[PDB]
Coordinates of all heavy atoms in Angstrom, one line a residue:
Chain C
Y636 N 108.8 24.4 60.7 CA 110.2 24.3 60.6 C 110.9 23.1 61.3 O 111.9 22.5 60.8 CB 110.9 25.6 61.1 CG 111.0 26.8 60.2 CD1 111.1 28.1 60.6 CD2 110.8 26.6 58.8 CE1 111.1 29.1 59.8 CE2 110.8 27.7 58.0 CZ 111.0 29.0 58.5 OH 111.0 30.0 57.7
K658 N 119.9 26.7 52.3 CA 118.6 27.2 51.9 C 117.6 27.2 53.0 O 116.8 28.1 53.1 CB 118.2 26.4 50.7 CG 118.6 26.8 49.3 CD 118.0 26.1 48.2 CE 116.7 26.7 47.8 NZ 116.9 27.9 47.0
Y659 N 117.5 26.1 53.7 CA 116.5 25.9 54.8 C 116.4 27.2 55.7 O 115.3 27.7 55.9 CB 116.8 24.6 55.6 CG 116.0 24.5 56.9 CD1 114.6 24.8 56.9 CD2 116.7 24.2 58.0 CE1 113.9 24.7 58.0 CE2 115.9 24.1 59.2 CZ 114.6 24.3 59.2 OH 113.9 24.2 60.4
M660 N 117.5 27.6 56.2 CA 117.5 28.7 57.2 C 117.6 30.0 56.4 O 117.9 31.1 57.0 CB 118.7 28.6 58.2 CG 118.5 27.3 59.1 SD 117.0 27.5 60.1 CE 117.5 28.8 61.2
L661 N 117.3 30.1 55.1 CA 117.4 31.3 54.4 C 116.6 32.4 54.9 O 117.1 33.5 55.2 CB 117.1 31.0 52.9 CG 117.1 32.3 52.0 CD1 118.4 33.0 52.0 CD2 116.8 31.9 50.6
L662 N 115.3 32.1 55.2 CA 114.4 33.1 55.6 C 114.8 33.6 57.1 O 114.9 34.8 57.4 CB 112.9 32.7 55.5 CG 111.9 33.7 56.1 CD1 112.0 35.0 55.4 CD2 110.5 33.1 56.0
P663 N 114.8 32.6 58.1 CA 115.2 33.1 59.5 C 116.5 33.8 59.5 O 116.7 34.8 60.2 CB 115.2 31.7 60.2 CG 114.4 30.8 59.4 CD 114.6 31.1 58.0
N664 N 117.5 33.3 58.7 CA 118.8 33.9 58.7 C 118.9 35.3 58.1 O 119.5 36.2 58.6 CB 119.9 33.0 57.9 CG 120.1 31.7 58.7 OD1 119.7 31.6 59.8 ND2 120.9 30.8 58.0
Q665 N 118.1 35.5 57.1 CA 117.9 36.8 56.4 C 117.3 37.9 57.4 O 117.7 39.0 57.5 CB 117.3 36.8 55.1 CG 115.8 36.6 55.1 CD 115.1 36.6 53.7 OE1 114.5 35.6 53.4 NE2 115.4 37.6 53.0
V666 N 116.3 37.4 58.0 CA 115.6 38.2 59.0 C 116.6 38.5 60.1 O 116.7 39.7 60.6 CB 114.3 37.7 59.6 CG1 113.6 38.5 60.5 CG2 113.3 37.3 58.4
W667 N 117.3 37.6 60.7 CA 118.3 37.8 61.7 C 119.3 38.8 61.2 O 119.7 39.7 62.0 CB 118.9 36.4 62.1 CG 120.1 36.6 63.0 CD1 121.4 37.1 62.6 CD2 120.1 36.5 64.4 NE1 122.2 37.1 63.7 CE2 121.5 36.8 64.8 CE3 119.2 36.1 65.4 CZ2 121.9 36.7 66.1 CZ3 119.7 36.0 66.6 CH2 120.9 36.3 67.1
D668 N 119.8 38.6 60.0 CA 120.8 39.6 59.5 C 120.3 41.0 59.4 O 121.0 42.0 59.7 CB 121.4 39.1 58.1 CG 122.3 40.2 57.5 OD1 123.3 40.5 58.1 OD2 121.9 40.5 56.4
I693 N 112.8 34.0 66.0 CA 113.9 33.5 65.2 C 114.7 32.4 66.0 O 115.0 31.3 65.5 CB 114.8 34.6 64.7 CG1 114.1 35.5 63.7 CG2 116.1 34.0 64.1 CD1 114.8 36.8 63.4
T696 N 112.8 29.2 66.4 CA 112.9 28.5 65.1 C 114.2 27.7 65.1 O 114.3 26.6 64.7 CB 112.7 29.3 64.0 OG1 113.6 30.5 64.1 CG2 111.3 29.9 63.9
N697 N 115.3 28.4 65.3 CA 116.6 27.9 65.3 C 116.8 26.7 66.3 O 117.5 25.7 66.0 CB 117.7 29.0 65.6 CG 118.2 29.7 64.4 OD1 119.3 29.5 63.8 ND2 117.3 30.5 63.8
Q711 N 124.9 26.6 60.3 CA 124.0 27.8 60.6 C 124.4 28.4 62.0 O 124.5 29.6 62.1 CB 122.5 27.3 60.7 CG 121.6 28.2 61.4 CD 121.5 29.6 60.8 OE1 122.1 29.9 59.8 NE2 120.9 30.6 61.6
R714 N 127.1 30.3 61.6 CA 126.9 31.5 60.9 C 126.4 32.6 61.8 O 126.8 33.8 61.6 CB 125.8 31.2 59.8 CG 125.4 32.5 59.0 CD 124.3 32.2 57.9 NE 124.1 33.3 57.1 CZ 123.4 34.4 57.5 NH1 122.9 34.5 58.7 NH2 123.2 35.4 56.7
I715 N 125.6 32.3 62.8 CA 124.9 33.3 63.6 C 125.6 33.4 65.0 O 125.0 34.1 65.8 CB 123.4 33.1 63.7 CG1 123.1 31.7 64.1 CG2 122.8 33.5 62.3 CD1 121.6 31.5 64.5

Side-chain angles (χ1 to χ4, degrees):
Chain C
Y636 278 161
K658 274 188 83 80
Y659 164 47
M660 295 299 291
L661 177 56
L662 173 62
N664 290 350
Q665 77 181 120
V666 181
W667 169 282
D668 170 60
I693 291 167
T696 50
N697 272 254
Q711 160 59 11
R714 181 183 183 284
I715 53 167

